[PDB]
Amino acid sequence: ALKAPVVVLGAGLASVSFVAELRQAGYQGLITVVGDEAERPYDRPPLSKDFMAHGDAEKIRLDCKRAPEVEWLLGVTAQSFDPQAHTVALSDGRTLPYGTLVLATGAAPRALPTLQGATMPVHTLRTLEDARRIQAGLRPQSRLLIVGGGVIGLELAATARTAGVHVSLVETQPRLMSRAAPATLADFVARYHAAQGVDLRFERSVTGSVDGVVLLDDGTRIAADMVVVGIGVLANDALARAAGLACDDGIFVDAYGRTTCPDVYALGDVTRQRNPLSGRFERIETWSNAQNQGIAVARHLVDPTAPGYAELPWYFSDQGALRIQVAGLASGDEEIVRGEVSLDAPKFTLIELQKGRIVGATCVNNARDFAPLRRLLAVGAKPDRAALADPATDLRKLAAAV
Amino acid sequence: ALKAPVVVLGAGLASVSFVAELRQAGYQGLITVVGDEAERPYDRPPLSKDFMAHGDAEKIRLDCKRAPEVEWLLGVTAQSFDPQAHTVALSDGRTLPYGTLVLATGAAPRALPTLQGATMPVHTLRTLEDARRIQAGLRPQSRLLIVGGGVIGLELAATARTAGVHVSLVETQPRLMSRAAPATLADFVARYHAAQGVDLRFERSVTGSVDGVVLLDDGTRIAADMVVVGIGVLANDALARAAGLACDDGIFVDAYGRTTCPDVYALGDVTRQRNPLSGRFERIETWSNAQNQGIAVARHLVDPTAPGYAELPWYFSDQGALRIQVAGLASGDEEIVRGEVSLDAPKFTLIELQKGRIVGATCVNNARDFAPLRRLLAVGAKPDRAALADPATDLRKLAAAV
Numbered sequence: 100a101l102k103a104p105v106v107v108l109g110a111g112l113a114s115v116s117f118v119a120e121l122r123q124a125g126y127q128g129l130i131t132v133v134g135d136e137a138e139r140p141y142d143r144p145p146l147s148k149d150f151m152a153h154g155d156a157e158k159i160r161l162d163c164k165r166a167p168e169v170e171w172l173l174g175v176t177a178q179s180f181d182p183q184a185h186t187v188a189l190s191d192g193r194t195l196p197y198g199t200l201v202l203a204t205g206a207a208p209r210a211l212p213t214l215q216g217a218t219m220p221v222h223t224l225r226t227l228e229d230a231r232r233i234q235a236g237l238r239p240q241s242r243l244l245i246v247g248g249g250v251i252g253l254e255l256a257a258t259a260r261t262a263g264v265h266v267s268l269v270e271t272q273p274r275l276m277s278r279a280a281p282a283t284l285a286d287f288v289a290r291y292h293a294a295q296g297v298d299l300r301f302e303r304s305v306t307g308s309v310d311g312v313v314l315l316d317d318g319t320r321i322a323a324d325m326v327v328v329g330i331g332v333l334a335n336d337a338l339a340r341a342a343g344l345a346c347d348d349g350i351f352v353d354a355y356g357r358t359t360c361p362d363v364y365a366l367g368d369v370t371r372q373r374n375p376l377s378g379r380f381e382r383i384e385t386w387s388n389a390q391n392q393g394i395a396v397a398r399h400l401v402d403p404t405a406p407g408y409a410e411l412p413w414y415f416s417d418q419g420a421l422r423i424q425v426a427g428l429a430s431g432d433e434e435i436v437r438g439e440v441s442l443d444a445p446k447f448t449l450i451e452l453q454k455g456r457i458v459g460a461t462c463v464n465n466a467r468d469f470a471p472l473r474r475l476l477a478v479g480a481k482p483d484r485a486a487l488a489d490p491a492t493d494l495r496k497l498a499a500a501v
Numbered sequence: 502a503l504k505a506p507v508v509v510l511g512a513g514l515a516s517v518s519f520v521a522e523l524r525q526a527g528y529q530g531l532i533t534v535v536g537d538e539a540e541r542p543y544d545r546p547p548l549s550k551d552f553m554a555h556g557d558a559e560k561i562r563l564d565c566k567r568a569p570e571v572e573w574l575l576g577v578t579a580q581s582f583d584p585q586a587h588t589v590a591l592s593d594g595r596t597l598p599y600g601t602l603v604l605a606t607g608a609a610p611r612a613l614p615t616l617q618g619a620t621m622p623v624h625t626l627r628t629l630e631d632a633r634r635i636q637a638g639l640r641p642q643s644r645l646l647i648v649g650g651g652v653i654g655l656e657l658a659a660t661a662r663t664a665g666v667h668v669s670l671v672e673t674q675p676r677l678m679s680r681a682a683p684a685t686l687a688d689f690v691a692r693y694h695a696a697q698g699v700d701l702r703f704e705r706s707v708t709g710s711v712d713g714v715v716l717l718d719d720g721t722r723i724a725a726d727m728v729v730v731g732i733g734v735l736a737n738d739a740l741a742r743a744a745g746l747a748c749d750d751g752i753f754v755d756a757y758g759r760t761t762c763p764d765v766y767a768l769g770d771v772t773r774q775r776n777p778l779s780g781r782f783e784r785i786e787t788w789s790n791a792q793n794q795g796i797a798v799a800r801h802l803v804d805p806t807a808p809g810y811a812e813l814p815w816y817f818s819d820q821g822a823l824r825i826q827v828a829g830l831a832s833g834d835e836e837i838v839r840g841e842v843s844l845d846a847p848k849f850t851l852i853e854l855q856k857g858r859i860v861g862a863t864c865v866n867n868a869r870d871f872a873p874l875r876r877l878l879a880v881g882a883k884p885d886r887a888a889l890a891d892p893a894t895d896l897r898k899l900a901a902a903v
């Protein structure tokens with residue numbers, strides 16, 4: 100399957116992780132990476148975190164040194180590829196040949212149709228450019244409206260509050276983090292943000308805006324100096340769609356990263372792939388997926404005897420005093436709570452079970468427990484539920500014993 | 502892409518349509534078809550229709566004469582395939598080599614978990630064997646319970662009523678034909694069946710059964726001599742899953758029928774594919790898809806310059822006095838009704854529009870209008886809505902003029 104030369108479209112974390120693994124696995128042929136951003140490859144999670152404090156992009160760059168002998172074509176957009184001719188057409192007029200093409204083009208923020216012709220600042224937060232523009236607007240005592248109660252919106256909320264910015268947040272759902280969070284976590288997170296002064300508006304949508312005021316579907320108004328929209332992302336799958344690959348807001352791939360087009364692979368945010376815990380296809384939107392899927396696909400390309408991608412999903416979110424870690428499924432048929440759920444010195448763990456089997460876990464300010472829980476999750480452990488609830492139980496011991 | 506020999510798994514309509522098109526398109530190499538049913542290939546729609554009257558399977562066979570020089574291995578199950586070795590393992594101990602493998606294995610009825618250990622006759626209606634067993638039980642004045650208000654259940658309802666069988670029908674949804682029918686149609690169909698003596702129970706599910714009585718979730722009972730379960734189907738994608746193809750209750754394919762595994766294609770009920778009207782992936786469960794997708798995939802395999810599959814979805818259902826035809830989407834932002842919707846001499850047409858563009862249509866006992874509407878639908882016609890409603894308008898003229 101691994102035919103030289105290798106061409107990768109996109110230069111984010113999935114791409115970097117993939118090319119480093121190709122080299123480490125022993126592939127020595129040509130590798131060329133096309134990245135549309137004119138930026139040394141960088142990690143995105145800092146952008147709604149410490150980057151908002153220090154503004155230093157040289158703290159967030161990805162290490163490409165495990166990827167030697169790679170030509171990175173930065174500031175260049177892949178415009179199309181021809182899977183018969185095995186070529187990629189570039190915005191600078193050049194063409195690249197490929198033996199193996201890898202689509203690692205990520206996802207872009209959804210726009211808000213109702214703010215389409217707005218006459219006040221409206222941003223999304225995906226890129227370094229976005230983060231710099233938003234950060235420049237976090238003036239103390241200014242008003243920020245965040246649209247969407249996803250993790251990135253909430254990370255920005257905590258960041259802005261730290262900066263002395265007044266924060267309102269509007270969410271269409273009755274809860275925060277509706278996408279991949281246990282309700283117990285979501286409820287607590289709302290309490291935390293409210294206590295930090297975030298003005299939360301649930302079950303509201305943006306209907307428009309007039310002369311610096313944002314309008315909502317309950318017939319009300321929110322004044323803001325800046326709006327940041329964070330209502331989710333859409334896969335950057337246009338090249339795949341045009342070339343005849345199977346796509347539906349994401350490129351369908353199997354556990355080997357194969358698309359429906361021979362010699363074309365995809366990885367990271369752009370893919371729609373099997374979640375082994377739910378057994379359903381999903382577009383996973385996580386840092387860990389980008390890295391882990393990139394590595395697994397590279398490893399199997401170099402060594403076809405290697406297993407396909409098999410890691411179970413997890414993410415982290417850093418929201419002010421809350422260091423949140425979530426693995427697996429948001430719910431099963433049972434939740435076990437370890438510790439008190441309290442705003443005082445927040446520290447707790449949730450475990451989700453399905454007929455006795457661990458299917459998900461959450462740690463808030465409890466990193467020590469998260470590793471053992473992910474191990475228990477990976478093997479589908481069925482531990483004694485009394486022991487799981489018992490504060491006397493050491494989860495690392497439990498994980499090591501299985 | 503077309504490498505000999507060709508092996509097809511499944512011998513239903515999709516398979517037959519595909520192999521006939523390969524031969525008609527000019528492919529002269531080996532073709533072998535593996536079909537698990539020990540039956541001359543046959544069409545399924547008659548099974549809930551006239552077959553219930555005449556019981557003559559020799560009226561429902563598929564014509565395989567446009568597929569000369571095909572070896573049909575009937576009564577044989579493909580147990581696995583090895584996509585590296587390019588072989589298929591058969592239940593009879595033999596192995597088949599392939600250059601091109603085509604998965605056309607269809608879908609199987611969902612079982613009802615709550616009737617799992619039932620001690621009364623419970624059938625599903627998919628195969629000739631099923632139809633013969635059900636037909637043998639349509640005793641006049643007996644009681645039949647049908648679970649599910651999908652088209653096949655309703656076709657059986659009409660058939661049983663014609664045979665003098667008392668019919669009850671339980672549906673979890675508040676309406677019939679929730680899957681792919683305009684609400685106006687579904688409401689009318691319920692009125693029709695009720696007028697024909699069908700005892701319809703909406704928003705009810707089966708919780709179990711005791712000594713010949715079926716139990717429902719509203720705490721009530723239904724006595725039946727026979728139960729026929731028709732709550733939908735599940736793709737027969739186990740071989741694909743085991744071999745590492747991308748699957749999620751159906752094998753993902755592009756418009757060329759390609760799976761994520763090189764040299765392996767899929768077609769028909771087993772596939773999850775793009776609906777060009779919704780732009781979303783869906784498992785299409787129709788006669789027209791089986792034939793049309795089979796033909797398109799064969800044509801493009803023989804002639805790579807041919808377009809991919811591009812037909813828009815449609816189905817028919819024959820329910821007593823109702824000859825129903827439905828194309829495209831169930832709804833848009835506008836419905837236009839042609840004719841009166843009446844139980845007297847039922848005859849009407851629905852047209853669904855989205856911002857002026859036809860996105861779906863329905864004809865009840867109005868076949869003459871269905872062809873022109875499908876043509877208007879295919880080109881995304883934007884006809885004058887006043888003309889569309891006007892009974893004076895000839896739709897065939899309108900279609901020919903575009």
Ligand SMILES: Cc1cc2nc3c(=O)[nH]c(=O)nc-3n(C[C@H](O)[C@H](O)[C@H](O)COP(=O)(O)OP(=O)(O)OC[C@H]3O[C@@H](n4cnc5c(N)ncnc54)[C@H](O)[C@@H]3O)c2cc1C
Nearest residue numbers: 109111112113135143144177204205367368384385386414
């Ligand atoms: C602000 C922010 C905070 C985040 N925080 C967390 C977190 O705390 N925890 C967590 O688990 N995840 C978090 N993530 C998500 C994580 O960063 C993503 O899952 C990850 O970036 C996905 O990596 P990727 O390489 O697949 O895609 P991307 O990072 O999107 O990289 C794809 C690259 O390809 C480029 N591209 C697209 N099309 C073309 C083309 N035609 N030609 C050339 N280049 C193209 C894109 O512009 C982009 O530069 C966060 C993301 C953001 C944006």
Ligand SMILES: Cc1cc2nc3c(=O)[nH]c(=O)nc-3n(C[C@H](O)[C@H](O)[C@H](O)COP(=O)(O)OP(=O)(O)OC[C@H]3O[C@@H](n4cnc5c(N)ncnc54)[C@H](O)[C@@H]3O)c2cc1C
Nearest residue numbers: 511513514515537545546579606607769770786787788816
């Ligand atoms: C009772 C009934 C009524 C219907 N009525 C209508 C209608 O009025 N209008 C309409 O539009 N559609 C109708 N349909 C749907 C239409 O018949 C289906 O869409 C069509 O049968 C799909 O064809 P297929 O070849 O993809 O799959 P199938 O017809 O299911 O054929 C697949 C074949 O592969 C076999 N198979 C599976 N696995 C293996 C294996 N491992 N090895 C060998 N063989 C295998 C299966 O057993 C089966 O024989 C009806 C279907 C049924 C069952």
